[PDB]
Amino acid sequence: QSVLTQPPSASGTPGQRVTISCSGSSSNIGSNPVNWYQQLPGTAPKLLIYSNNQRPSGVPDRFSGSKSGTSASLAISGLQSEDEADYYCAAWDDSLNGVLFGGGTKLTVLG
Amino acid sequence: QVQVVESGAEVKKPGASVKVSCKASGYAFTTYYMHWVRQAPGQGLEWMGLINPSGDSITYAQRFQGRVTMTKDTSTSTVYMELSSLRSEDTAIYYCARDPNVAFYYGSGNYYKDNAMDVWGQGTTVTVSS
Amino acid sequence: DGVGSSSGNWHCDSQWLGDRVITTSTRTWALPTYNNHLYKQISNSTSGGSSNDNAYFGYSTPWGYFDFNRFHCHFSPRDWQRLINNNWGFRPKRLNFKLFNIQVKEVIANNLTSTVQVFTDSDYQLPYVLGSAHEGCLPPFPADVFMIPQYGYLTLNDGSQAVGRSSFYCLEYFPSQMLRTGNNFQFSYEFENVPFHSSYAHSQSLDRLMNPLIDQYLYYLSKTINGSGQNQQTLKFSVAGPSNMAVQGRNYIPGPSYRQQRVSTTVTQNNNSEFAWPGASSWALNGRNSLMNPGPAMASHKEGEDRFFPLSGSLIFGKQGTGRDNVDADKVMITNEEEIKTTNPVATESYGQVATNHQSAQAQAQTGWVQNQGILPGMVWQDRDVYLQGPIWAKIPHTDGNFHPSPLMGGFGMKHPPPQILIKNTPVPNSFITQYSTGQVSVEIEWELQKENSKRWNPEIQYTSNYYKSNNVEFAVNTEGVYSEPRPIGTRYLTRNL
Amino acid sequence: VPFHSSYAHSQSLDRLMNPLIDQYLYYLSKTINGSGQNQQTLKFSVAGPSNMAVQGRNYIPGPSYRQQRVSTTVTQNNNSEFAWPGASSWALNGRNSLMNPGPAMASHKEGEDRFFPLSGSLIITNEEEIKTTNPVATESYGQVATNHQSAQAQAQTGWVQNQGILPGMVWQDRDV
Amino acid sequence: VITTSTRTWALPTYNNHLYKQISNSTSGGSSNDNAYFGYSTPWGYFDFNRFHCHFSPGFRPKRLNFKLFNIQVKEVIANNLTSTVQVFTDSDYQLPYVLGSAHEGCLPPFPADVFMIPQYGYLTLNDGSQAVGRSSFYCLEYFPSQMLRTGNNFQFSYEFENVPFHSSYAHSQSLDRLAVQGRNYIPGPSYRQQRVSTTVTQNNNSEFAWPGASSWALNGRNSLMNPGPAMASHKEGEDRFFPLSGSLIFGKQGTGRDNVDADKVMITNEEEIKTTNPVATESYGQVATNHQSAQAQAQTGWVQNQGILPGMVWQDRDVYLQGPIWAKIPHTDGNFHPSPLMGGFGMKHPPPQILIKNTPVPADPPTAFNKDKLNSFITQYSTGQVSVEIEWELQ
Amino acid sequence: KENSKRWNPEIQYTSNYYKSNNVEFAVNTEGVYSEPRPIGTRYLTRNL
Amino acid sequence: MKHPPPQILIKNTPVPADPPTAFNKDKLNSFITQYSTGQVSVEIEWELQ
Amino acid sequence: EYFPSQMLRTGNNFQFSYEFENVPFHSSYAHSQSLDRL
Amino acid sequence: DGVGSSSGNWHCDSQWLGDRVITTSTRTWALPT
Amino acid sequence: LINNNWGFRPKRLNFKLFNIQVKEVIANNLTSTVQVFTDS
Amino acid sequence: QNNNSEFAWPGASSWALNGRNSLMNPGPAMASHKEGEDRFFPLSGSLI
């Protein structure tokens, strides 16, 4: 009964801000840290944000992460063509007693 | 540099058992957690199991309990994943991910370990077909 | 007493003394003139009277009335957390009510010689409208000024017409005290003895009460046939024990059931049709169909299903600033009863199966589902939980008979509940000076507690605030000053043995 | 013993509400946006004076065991013998006894004076005074969900022909 | 009546002095209706809850006196004079109460038999074989208890709370003979049982034991309805039929545990109560399912289950020399006719559980201090004498 | 005891609601008692 | 001081404007413009050295 | 508002008294000597 | 007192009285040389 | 404790030692003693 | 995120008594980490 849900798609033009959000149960997003993964086609996922807002070394400042209540959002600013990839929000889920991934959000640049 | 060399692609019939090996080199094998996550060809990521830095404690996703086995070999620095009684839906890519968060945080409220995996293996394509 | 001297002070606080709690609340009210000082017949036909299920007849009155009948009137969110974490049971004991600092206006200036009529109905001679969970209560947050609701009542109807048995009531016919800006009004009330409300959950289930290590000395029928073939009939018997716990004989069976339709919060799992009214559980009274709401107390769902809820089974609260009509499911708060699944059947499930025939050599054993089940001897059940936002008491209807009078929406059933307190402006002359009153109200209720004696080794589940950072504090004002209650809080956290 | 009640209620069990004010409770008003495919939604409305059927109530009517209905206008009755056959009965040690007079219920719906329960009326007395708190003898007690709806199954209900005691019931006894 | 009984007991060491989590997957699991989660304790307990403990071959209990004496502790065989035994009553009813579950391990009916004290265990909330956070764990060491060496004794008294007399008589009048007459009272409630014949050829040739059984469901688990509401076992003239799960069934002396034939068991019958109560295998009666008219014939349907109605009179289930005496009424908001369904006297404060275990006596320590608790112990058991005395009040 | 006037509810120590193979602060199947986490004393609040 | 001179809190009681003649469950946002005035005296006994 | 308070019309008054807890005297003197010249 | 009589009983519980708590703990020990 | 209280502190202490058993290597030694004292 | 060298003893805070160095453990009472950083802990500053 605990789910992670994100919009299947998003869109924006280079330089605009794009926010990607997912909705989670009390057991997962509410009580556990949320991490974000970005996956380009034909390549393994790359960690973007960890521990809700923390950003790993070698990761651009434009990406930003926030957690509010049971909902987690990822913000991308100063958007570029390279940024376009599938985005997954993940969190440990207590009821499941394992890691749970969102369905993924495919971002589409315009041009 | 840190590397996670994923095993070779394979082709299996239903009922067969497939073992995927993950060979790590360039860092301390014992120190980190290792996650297994499968991705169907057109579908999002799905977490399968977890093995702790010591190899003693292992957690599985509920879907996979009893048909999956994970083992860690300190000698050759290799983690293995065992999937049994294969099905058509099993066909996916199997990623091996390293987890740099060693300890639990015990703040007010429920405790938690951050499960963010920085290093990912190239992946292995396992097809279940006749 | 006088114009320039206050007739009462501001009392809001909570005294936690031993096994009792004393809650005190003061608010500011404003009382308009209703119906332009008149009594007016009301019915459905003025609204068109299309639906016979919705038909009604009655009268609206110029009087207003006071409603403190929700728990958040008397308890702060902190004091409620102190109650439900620390106690197995509670119940109201004494009641003290005070009305003071009256101010009458003219439309804006004072009218110093104007009066306010206020009486309480302590013989219960008027229709009792407080147990219907209507809006108009004292606001939860002490700084908010609230409006006094208008009093009205319904009597017997045929369609929109009345009948010879229909009673008309004039509230002027009652003796009432009249107050100017220097007078005040007060009375005390004594709750009749009621059972404690159970603010705990069971750590055992009705079917698991056994010793897991030991066999019973009773036998059950294991086999009706030896094997596959012809004429293999036999009777075999087995000890009931730890291996098979389903077949063991038991002394007590779960409570009654009246089945509700199941609705998922994930909408694509629901059928693509309008089933709200048509697929609803309901009862019929004199040809009119009323929904069964909330209905008998039943577990909202099985464990591992949080998405399903009974269609009319649970109390649903609206969030702060939620619309009136056709709001989305994220605008409302659906309460669930997960703590009674131990003694109570699931609302969306059948009670069980029964044998529908006599088997014989030519006929198989047939069974059928029990969709609704009345009371049977040997049942045990829990009542419905109470909430910070929920009702407190209800008036037991005065009848020849009743069973387990506890009101279905939850709380304390009483044959003599706290009395209706009626209030209106005395008219100052069909042409009348436009006028209204305002003042203060203080209410004081004493609550008896039942302390928790448990020997449980591991820690309890407690109600807690979440630590992680947020734009707003829960149960506080926002930047615009609006007070809100983000979630319903039940009373059941601590556990007891079954 | 208790005083025998020799009075009729001026209120009905379903109309006890204040007609002027809304409840703070909600009900499920609308399960689909409208005509089409994949229209599932959940809308909620306040229970209020306009729709009084859907409001939450603290007490529910008493128990019922349904009687067959007999019209004093003989041509409205079926042309067959069903006095014994169509009778509500109970069984004790393999012997059938007629259910007479039976549980106290209202003899007829409002405005219909020609119908009387086959075995539910002392003989002809009418019980209509108790229809405020008591279900009608010749009507089903209500409806109950007989399944789990889903994308593949429509919601289904069944008629309750007999209903035992439930917590929260209030009823009147038979008059003397 | 005052009955007095004295027996000789032997108390082993359970679980090697350990509390141990037990669950469905510990016993092999695999059945959703059978899943459980709980704990087993090193403690034992005394159960006199059956009548044949107090009786050789209207009434109700009044007072209870308990005594534990002549304690003999043994090491494994010699006497250990310095050892102790711990016993406490649970008089606050703070532990899970297992005495109303009709288990084995009673004081033996024949006064010269020596019996083994059973092991105490309990169940808490499970989901599958797992445990929810609401599941409770009780350590019985966290209760104060009296410690007894070989010369010490233990005694306490108890007062049965006011209960109705159990009826031990049969009605001459049937309810309906006090067909179409008007009557003031109707028979009691029913929940229909499937009818099984003791002539096997008469029964259908299929397996219908569990499938054709009446059951109730709680949180998705199915539990057999056994014995269920008290109902007449068979119609007058037919004694070869019995409700499938509607009656108490006992073993004959030396009856096997699994799949015993029908002559190794003794099937009780309720046939006395058919005066006030319906037959368990019959419908309660008929109800009208429609409105007749010139275009529609009258329709009736069968009542398989009927709840309480105003005007019901019924009898409770009979008690037996082999059967239980009391059960603990579950602590709940509400109940109806709390008399337990297997028979006897339902009580909110039944006779308190009496818990007993041997104090652990460790073996020689390592001589170098070790952080760990000591897992090596002297093999040990105790024996003694129990007397139990109950005052009964006849009617 | 605390006399606190705080309106909104406090933070409390509470055991997890969700299912688990074992009970926190209990024995396992082998009879081993264990303490799953450290529990500090500071939950309720005061003004400074 | 651990227990200094206590805080003294003061506000004007709100007096609502004319309410509507049909009931509404919202809190009242309409008030009479109002202020108060008065006198304050404070007396402290100072011990000297 | 969740604190009890007195309510005053135009003829009412409010008073209370308080006792300063014991504190040391404040020094309002200038030293003639310095710490190094003692 | 003697060999065959216990010199103490088992006391483990807590007692919560007003502004005080009384904790009582009993254990079994083993002392080597 | 920690949910309901702003403070706590120990007041009184009561210590007891009883049910002595002395063993030889296994058999009971009835005449052996155990020494105990406190440094107060 | 830690440096790739051994600093457990070398990077320790400590006090010296009659020539013998003692680790400062747990030391004076101080907050373990800044708000929002749960992954950092003081080397000897915490009880483990």
Residue numbers in the entry:
A (entry chain L): 21 to 131
B (entry chain H): 20 to 149
C (entry chain F): 219 to 325, 334 to 655, 668 to 736
D (entry chain E): 420 to 542, 560 to 612
E (entry chain D): 239 to 295, 307 to 325, 334 to 435, 472 to 688
F (entry chain C): 689 to 736
G (entry chain A): 640 to 688
H (entry chain A): 398 to 435
Please give me the paper's original passages concerning this structure:
The AAV vectors are composed of non-enveloped T = 1 icosahedral capsids, consisting of 60 viral proteins (VP), and package single-stranded DNA transgene cassettes. A major challenge for the utilization of AAV vectors in the clinic is the presence of pre-existing neutralizing antibodies (NAbs) in a large percentage of the human population. The presence of pre-existing neutralizing antibodies in large portions of the human population poses a significant challenge for AAV-mediated gene therapy, primarily targeting the capsid leading to vector inactivation and loss of treatment efficacy. This study structurally characterizes the interactions of 21 human-derived neutralizing antibodies from three patients treated with the AAV9 vector, Zolgensma®, utilizing high-resolution cryo-electron microscopy. The antibodies bound to the 2-fold depression or the 3-fold protrusions do not conform to the icosahedral symmetry of the capsid, thus requiring localized reconstructions. These complex structures provide unprecedented details of the mAbs binding interfaces, with many antibodies inducing structural perturbations of the capsid upon binding.
In each map, the capsid was well ordered, while the densities for the Fabs above the 2-fold axis could not be interpreted for model building. As for the 3-fold antibodies, only a single Fab bound to the 2-fold region, in two potential binding modes, resulting in distorted densities during icosahedral averaging. For the sixteen 2-fold binding Fabs, this strategy resulted in maps reconstructed to 2.54–3.56 Å resolution. The localized reconstructions with C2 symmetry relaxation confirmed that only a single Fab is bound at the 2-fold region. In all maps, the VH and VL chains are well-ordered, enabling the building of atomic models. The epitopes for the sixteen 2-fold Fabs comprise VR-III to -VII, and -IX of the AAV9 capsid. On the aa level, all 2-fold-Fabs contact D532 and Y706. Other frequently contacted residues are T491, T492, R533, D556, N562, N704, and Y705, which are clustered around the 2-fold symmetry axis. Furthermore, for all the 2-fold Fab-complexes, movements occurred in VR-IX near the 2-fold axis. While, for AAV9 capsids in absence of Fabs the residues 704–707 adopt the same conformation in both symmetry-related VR-IX loops surrounding the 2-fold axis, there are numerous variations of side-chain orientations in the different Fab complex structures.
